[PDB]
Write a protein that binds this DNA or RNA. Structure first.
Lengths: 127, 122, 197, 106, 167
RNA sequence: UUGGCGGAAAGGCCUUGGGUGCUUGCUGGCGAAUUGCAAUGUCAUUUUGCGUGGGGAUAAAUCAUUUGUAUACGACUUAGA
RNA sequence: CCUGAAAAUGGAUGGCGCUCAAGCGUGUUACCUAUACUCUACCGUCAGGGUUGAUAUGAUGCCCUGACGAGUAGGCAGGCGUGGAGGUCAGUGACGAAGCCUAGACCGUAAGGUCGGGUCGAACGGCCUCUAGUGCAGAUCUUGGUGGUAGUAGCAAAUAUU
RNA sequence: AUACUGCCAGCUGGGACUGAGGACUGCGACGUAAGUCAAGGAUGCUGGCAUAAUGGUUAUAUGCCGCCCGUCUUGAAACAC
RNA sequence: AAAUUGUUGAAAGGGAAGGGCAUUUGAUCAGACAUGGUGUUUUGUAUU
């Protein structure tokens, strides 16, 4: 398709889970930096969870890109498709979840008409 | 639910040491078994190949009472009622067999090797 | 190299042999050790008896049945050394100790087969001449091993059997060599020799 | 006749490691018959296969293989350092591996 | 809509790569393989099998043959890094070797639509192989035991250390 | 099978016998390809089946009852067609 | 090296063990590896700069170069999320909004966002701003609910029932 | 001549990791001039599958590592709360 | 909804469990080869 752009396999794919979220149910997995004085996670002891930081940032020339190489644009109608028309190979439409079935098939038909990629062109239909 | 209960010989049939004779639970369960047998008879089932295919007892809302303790204190005295459900089904043989075909993907080297083996075989 | 390596313990220093065997087991080689009663320890017999007496003194205060277990057999003494040199509380250590086998004397499946030597652990090659050493069988009998005489009798029986086998093999081999000499000095033998075989 | 081995037997021993930290990306290989870095040099830059068997047929076979190569020596006793396509499972410590003669130079 | 026109215009035209300075130079083969040397194929269908090296093809490959009558290896191409050169050598005089090339080893790649879900040789190719191997046998005959040496396949035995082993 | 030996964990080691194969000890004839320049390129364990069939002699234990050389309950020691 | 040299659970050159050592003193020399050093890629920060050729890039746009990156108390900056308000999307919706469940997917370093599949039936969201009763893991926090303990302690004074 | 030391803008060989990047450009090398180069960052050729094969997620297993968080404190895993 | 429970079922289990780095195995899943390519032997050539 295109050139082998960077961010091939491994920078950090694992989710950054909050400390002790597995220990307690009251503790959600949404990341929270440990502010404790004696916290081993904050103190960065060996064998502990890794903390989010700026070093993990993905390449600027590939950030926000999907595996297909397209940035995902949330679309609610053929008007958003029209604004996505001229950038087919770099953008991919994604129908909003609260779109009715008939309108969803309308967006799918229009996106097929102008070649715009859709990241969920399979919902609310049979095979 | 067997902590600190006694032991008996009548558990050796099940390989355990702790068994009891819960008369009230047995009466409730056998009443429900009779009800299920009646339901199956009304449905036209065999009633001789019937086996308990599903059974489940879960907790019900507690019935609250009070007990009186030393030094003018009040503690709960609660019953633990049961929601019992069971489904008796006509017993049948093995449901199905002949699993998926599991299409095989062979490379050029593998196809050449199998062709050579087939040619060598006589 | 080999699927199973059989080492006889006679003339070997317990620590050096245990270290070598432990490294081989970790590298993945199955090992059996025989003549563990004829294994050797450097130092006076009294010194090693005192060391084992300290080991015996070590035991759990509140339950000796869960305390350290002081095995008296020579093969189990060698096993204790090897288990000390192998990380035995992990699955890799359990695998290595399963790969290891130790015996007193040589049971049939191993006395009918080949026994190798470890020069790095041999007492003659390692110890300075004149330095005192100890025999594992004697030390084990001192600390309470009850089968020195039985193992000695069985080893004597096996040694006579092996001596008769060796006499038969030596006679057969010398006849083979005599016939090879008769059929020798041929073109094929001369060609092989001049080539370098 | 009875022998068809075109490789050299070796043992995957462990990972590259310090006393208390290991690096799974590099494995240590003991080549059979090699006891010195001098022969390790001849064995440098050579393909390695770890061949194992799985109970499930994946692509027409029940045998799976991991590919790597001897890259450089390790120590004074003929142990070499190998890097595989995927790091070895670490249950294969002291496990049989095959070192092939290719890419050949002799 | 959310926007009438994007103020920033992304690049649509793919950036053509600039002129790379990586020229191609002819491969330098190792000195241990000269045409006529007996090689040991180590991989493929004929792995561990002794063939004879004839020509260095233009696509960095080696043109070898069994000969076919000896061990069943036809006139093929192999890889220098996968062959093992030996001290044994046969003179390739009297053979024609300049006819074969990549055009000779054209593939005619099979199509994707044709898949073998259930389960030949050119007469010119077989005749060329016959002529070449006839000439090669006419050479090979004079050296004793060489025909059997090429017929036998190579293998590594217990105790064989290739680093200490001379080919 | 005849003749043995081997109880340390023998379970293996030998031996006179008959039938077949193979033999590269030496000389031959035919075949190999296209797995397409390499892909481990697949080769020698514990059991199961409404199996493929040849031999095969068709039992115990537990609960319940009982005993008291036993016993908190288990367990134990007996009896009972 | 030995004697001097004796303390209480069993016991510690880290352990095994080691005796021309695997001990002690001293010398070559090879070898192992830290988030350190060198080189390369990427992220961010900072600094120095280039850019008014088309009637294409709010020049807060694009681009070049180099250096740097620990962090409690604390400071500042840039962002995520919530309840309401003014605009706009003539935005989403009973052909299914909000909500909830889902070892299903994608994106962001992250706060989180978007989607796939179930349940559900009436409202709700993005963008530019305004506003605050705006983010919980703790406070022997408040209210409510629920566990293990646990079918456990126990339901044995007042003679006694058949 | 040769333990040695120092230098070579000396000659060969075997390995490994990496391949960042643009609409004319710069600095250079190579027979008495056509232009080509290893000179401001990888290309050429050839193979296998047109898929869970590579991968992402997840549950185990394995090697090494990993003390329970918040707080007071010079010092907390603490037999401190 | 959660805590806390009973049952489709899946895996683990020698005095805890949970976690990080890295693979393996089993389960599951997205991305990608009708993409803007041959002008006429297959066709459903104003549809290419």
């Amino acid at each position: 398709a295109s050139l082998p752009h960077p961010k091939i396999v491994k920078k950090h794919t694992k989710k950054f889970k909050r400390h002790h979220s597995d220990r307690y149910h009251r503790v959600a997995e949404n990341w929270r930096k440990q502010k404790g004085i004696d916290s081993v996670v904050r103190r960065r002891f060996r064998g502990n969870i890794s903390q989010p930081k700026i070093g993990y940032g993905s390449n600027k020339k590939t950030k926000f890109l999907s595996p297909s190489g397209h940035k995902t644009f949330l679309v609610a109608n053929v008007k958003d498709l029209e604004t996505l028309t001229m950038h087919t190979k770099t953008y991919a439409a994604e129908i909003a979840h609260n779109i009715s079935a008939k309108n969803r098939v309308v967006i799918l038909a229009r996106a097929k008409a102008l070649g715009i990629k859709v990241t969920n062109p399979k919902g609310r239909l049979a095979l | 639910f067997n902590s600190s209960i006694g032991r008996t010989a009548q558990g050796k049939e099940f390989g355990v040491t702790k068994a009891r004779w819960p008369a009230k639970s047995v009466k409730f369960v056998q009443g429900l078994l009779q009800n299920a047998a009646a339901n199956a008879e009304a449905k036209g089932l065999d009633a001789t190949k019937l086996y308990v295919s599903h059974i489940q007892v879960n907790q019900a809302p507690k019935q609250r009472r009070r007990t009186y303790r030393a030094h003018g204190r009040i503690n709960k005295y609660e019953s633990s009622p049961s929601h019992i459900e069971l489904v008796v089904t006509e017993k049948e043989e093995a449901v199905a067999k002949a699993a998926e075909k599991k299409v095989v993907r062979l490379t050029s080297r593998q196809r050449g090797r199998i062709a050579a083996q087939k040619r060598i075989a006589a | 190299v080999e699927p199973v390596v059989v080492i006889d313990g006679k003339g070997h220093l317990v620590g050096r042999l245990a270290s070598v065997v432990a490294k081989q087991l970790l590298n993945g080689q199955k090992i059996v050790v025989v003549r563990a009663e004829e294994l050797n320890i450097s130092g006076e017999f009294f010194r090693n008896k005192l060391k084992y007496h300290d080991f015996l003194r070590k035991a759990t205060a509140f339950n000796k049945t869960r305390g350290p277990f002081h095995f008296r057999a020579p093969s189990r003494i060698f096993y204790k050394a090897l288990r000390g040199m192998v990380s035995h509380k992990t699955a890799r250590g359990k695998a290595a100790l399963e790969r290891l086998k130790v015996f007193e004397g040589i049971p049939p499946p191993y006395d009918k087969k080949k026994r190798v030597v470890v020069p790095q652990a041999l007492r003659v090659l390692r110890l300075k001449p004149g330095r005192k050493y100890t025999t594992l069988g004697k030390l084990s009998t001192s600390v309470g091993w009850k089968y020195e005489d039985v193992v000695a009798k069985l080893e004597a029986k096996r040694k006579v059997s092996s001596a008769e086998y060796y006499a038969k093999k030596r006679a057969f081999t010398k006849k083979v060599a005599s016939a090879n000499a008769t059929a020798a000095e041929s073109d094929v033998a001369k060609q092989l020799a001049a080539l370098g075989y | 006749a009875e022998s068809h081995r075109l490789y050299v037997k070796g043992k995957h021993l462990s990972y590259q490691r310090s006393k208390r930290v290991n690096n799974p990306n590099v494995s240590l290989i003991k080549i059979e018959g090699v006891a010195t870095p001098q022969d390790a040099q001849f064995y440098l830059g050579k393909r390695i296969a770890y061949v194992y068997r799985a109970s499930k047929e994946v692509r027409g076979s029940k045998i799976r293989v991991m590919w790597g190569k001897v890259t450089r020596t390790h120590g004074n006793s003929g142990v070499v350092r190998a890097t595989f396509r995927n790091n070895l499972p670490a249950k294969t410590f002291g496990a049989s591996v095959r070192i092939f003669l290719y890419p050949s130079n002799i | 809509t959310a926007q009438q026109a994007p103020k920033w215009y992304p690049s649509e035209d793919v950036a053509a790569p600039k002129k790379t300075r990586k020229a191609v130079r002819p491969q330098k083969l190792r000195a241990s393989l000269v045409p006529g040397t007996v090689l040991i194929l180590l991989a493929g269908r004929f792995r561990g099998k002794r063939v004879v090296y004839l020509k260095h093809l233009e696509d960095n490959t080696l043109l070898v043959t069994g000969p076919f009558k000896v061990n069943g290896v036809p006139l093929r191409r192999v890889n220098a890094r996968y062959v093992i050169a030996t001290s044994t050598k046969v003179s390739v005089e009297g053979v024609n070797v300049e006819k074969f090339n990549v055009e000779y080893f054209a593939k005619e790649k099979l199509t994707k639509k044709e898949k073998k879900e259930a389960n030949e040789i050119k007469t010119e190719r077989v005749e060329d192989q016959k002529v070449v191997d006839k000439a090669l046998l006419a050479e090979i005959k004079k050296t004793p035991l060489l025909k059997q040496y090429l017929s036998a396949s190579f293998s590594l035995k217990n105790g064989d250390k290739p680093h200490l082993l001379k080919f």
